[PDB]
Design an enzyme around this catalytic site. Structure first.
Site, mmCIF file in Angstrom:
data_model
loop_
_atom_site.group_PDB
_atom_site.id
_atom_site.type_symbol
_atom_site.label_atom_id
_atom_site.label_comp_id
_atom_site.label_asym_id
_atom_site.label_seq_id
_atom_site.Cartn_x
_atom_site.Cartn_y
_atom_site.Cartn_z
ATOM 1 N N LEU A 14 0.866 -1.195 0.000
ATOM 2 C CA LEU A 14 0.000 0.000 0.000
ATOM 3 C C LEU A 14 0.892 1.231 0.000
ATOM 4 C CD1 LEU A 14 -2.826 -1.083 2.456
ATOM 5 C CD2 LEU A 14 -3.037 -0.856 -0.034
ATOM 6 N N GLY A 15 1.986 1.164 0.754
ATOM 7 C CA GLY A 15 2.944 2.254 0.845
ATOM 8 C C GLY A 15 4.259 1.912 1.503
ATOM 9 N N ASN A 18 8.700 6.337 6.270
ATOM 10 C CA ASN A 18 9.885 6.559 7.100
ATOM 11 C C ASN A 18 10.242 5.247 7.791
ATOM 12 N N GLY A 20 9.620 2.275 7.247
ATOM 13 C CA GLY A 20 8.613 1.221 7.248
ATOM 14 C C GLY A 20 7.768 1.105 5.996
ATOM 15 N N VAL A 22 3.611 -0.304 4.653
ATOM 16 C CA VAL A 22 2.235 -0.691 4.937
ATOM 17 C C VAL A 22 1.819 -1.631 3.801
ATOM 18 C CG1 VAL A 22 -0.097 0.044 5.568
ATOM 19 C CG2 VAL A 22 1.844 1.572 6.020
ATOM 20 N N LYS A 41 1.353 -2.582 9.066
ATOM 21 C CA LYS A 41 2.598 -1.829 9.048
ATOM 22 C C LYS A 41 3.670 -2.613 9.798
ATOM 23 C CE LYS A 41 5.066 2.314 10.292
ATOM 24 N NZ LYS A 41 5.038 3.778 10.588
ATOM 25 N N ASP A 131 2.868 15.231 11.236
ATOM 26 C CA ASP A 131 2.938 14.911 9.804
ATOM 27 C C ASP A 131 1.573 15.051 9.133
ATOM 28 O OD1 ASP A 131 4.477 14.184 7.545
ATOM 29 O OD2 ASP A 131 4.420 12.027 7.977
HETATM 30 C C1 LIG Z 1 -1.653 8.287 -1.164
HETATM 31 C C2 LIG Z 1 -1.751 6.806 -1.494
HETATM 32 C C3 LIG Z 1 -2.360 6.078 -0.270
HETATM 33 O O1 LIG Z 1 -3.507 5.626 -0.420
HETATM 34 N N1 LIG Z 1 -1.617 5.855 0.932
HETATM 35 C C4 LIG Z 1 -2.242 5.250 2.121
HETATM 36 C C5 LIG Z 1 -1.593 3.918 2.473
HETATM 37 N N2 LIG Z 1 -2.134 3.496 3.756
HETATM 38 C C6 LIG Z 1 -3.345 2.862 4.006
HETATM 39 N N3 LIG Z 1 -4.215 2.558 2.977
HETATM 40 C C7 LIG Z 1 -5.388 1.948 3.319
HETATM 41 N N4 LIG Z 1 -5.837 1.571 4.547
HETATM 42 C C8 LIG Z 1 -4.938 1.895 5.548
HETATM 43 N N5 LIG Z 1 -5.111 1.682 6.891
HETATM 44 C C9 LIG Z 1 -3.977 2.195 7.574
HETATM 45 C C10 LIG Z 1 -3.097 2.743 6.655
HETATM 46 C C11 LIG Z 1 -3.676 2.548 5.363
HETATM 47 C C12 LIG Z 1 -0.078 4.041 2.575
HETATM 48 C C13 LIG Z 1 0.542 4.732 1.349
HETATM 49 C C14 LIG Z 1 -0.128 6.065 1.037
HETATM 50 C C15 LIG Z 1 0.286 7.189 1.982
#
Ligand SMILES: *CCC(=O)N1C[C@H](Nc2ncnc3[nH]ccc23)CC[C@@H]1C
Length: 278
Positions: A14-15, A18, A20, A22, A41, A131
């Site tokens: 998903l991402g 810093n 880490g 997700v 995470k 942040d």
């Molecule tokens: C900007 C692109 C984006 O969607 N994200 C969010 C992502 N985190 C995340 N997505 C869905 N459900 C979650 N529950 C906790 C954290 C999430 C991480 C990458 C980027 C910033």
């Protein structure tokens, strides 16, 4: 609250942030692909400071209970992983860019009110987010947003209303308050400055061409951080977004008051955003 390692099935990234990442996982104890999706995470690579900071983030999120803060689900042990609810609509920044022709000013005001309510609650917990940006806000639905990513969050001691960081930040500099840029000072009042940048992001639908970075760089040998501090100290600010209601721009300007003590509180901002109609 306790998720077994062997039952968390990796699906996609998903991402990455810093120190880490997700990931989207399915918590699938039946092993038949029918289990629920979760956002997980974990720290990418080892470090003693990063591990202490990761445990801190888990402790902060676990104790936050608000409709406007991403829900903590639990942990998996090897604390190996932080398990959270999965919000498929994802980050507010990309959401605004895709649905810009569908969302009106009333809808942006609703999101602003929800983020302000979540921030007022964080403040009541003595939590400094550090942040706050549209990329760190998640979308639950078309009419519901939630603050996420407590990776840099700090709890204020009972007798001190700010904190000082040893090394300067690693986030895009265009959301930091002047006192954070100059002295690495963070407080609930520097989160208010960042919220003003979030309001700007909402009312530009996170358009890249007028983003805080594109626009501050356009307005800007001297270091960029010192040059941004120079612009800000002079009283220069991001301009009113195209077609922004005058009252919304006036609130952004209050959030961007030079002195942290002159910025409005999240409790004072809330009824004002609600009055403009959320
Ligand atoms: C900007 C692109 C984006 O969607 N994200 C969010 C992502 N985190 C995340 N997505 C869905 N459900 C979650 N529950 C906790 C954290 C999430 C991480 C990458 C980027 C910033």
């Amino acid at each position: 609250t306790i998720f077994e390692e062997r039952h968390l099935k990796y699906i996609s990234q998903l991402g990455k942030g810093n120190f880490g990442s997700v990931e989207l996982c399915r918590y699938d104890p039946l092993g038949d692909n029918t289990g629920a999706l979760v956002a997980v995470k974990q720290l990418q690579h080892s470090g003693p400071d990063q591990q202490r900071d990761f445990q801190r983030e888990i402790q902060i999120l676990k104790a936050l209970h608000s409709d406007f803060i991403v829900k903590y689900r639990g942990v998996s042990y090897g604390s190996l992983r932080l398990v959270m609810e999965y919000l498929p609509s994802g980050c507010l920044r990309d959401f605004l860019q895709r649905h810009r022709a569908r969302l009106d000013a009333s809808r942006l005001l609703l999101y602003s009110s929800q983020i302000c309510k979540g921030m007022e609650y964080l403040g009541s917990r003595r939590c400094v987010h550090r942040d706050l940006a549209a990329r760190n806000i998640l979308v639950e639905s078309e009419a519901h947003v939630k603050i996420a990513d407590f990776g840099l969050a700090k709890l204020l001691p009972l007798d001190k209303d700010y904190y000082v960081v040893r090394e300067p930040g690693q986030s895009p500099i265009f959301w930091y308050a002047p006192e954070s840029l100059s002295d690495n000072i963070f407080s609930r009042q520097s989160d208010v400055w960042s919220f003003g940048v979030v309001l700007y992001e909402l009312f530009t639908y996170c358009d890249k061409s007028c983003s805080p970075s594109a626009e501050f760089l356009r307005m800007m040998d001297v270091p960029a951080l010192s040059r941004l501090l120079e612009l800000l100290e002079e009283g220069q600010r991001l301009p009113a977004p195209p077609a922004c209601p005058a009252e919304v721009h006036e609130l952004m300007k209050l959030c961007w008051a030079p002195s942290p003590q002159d910025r409005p509180s999240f409790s004072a901002l809330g009824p004002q955003l609600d009055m403009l109609w959320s």
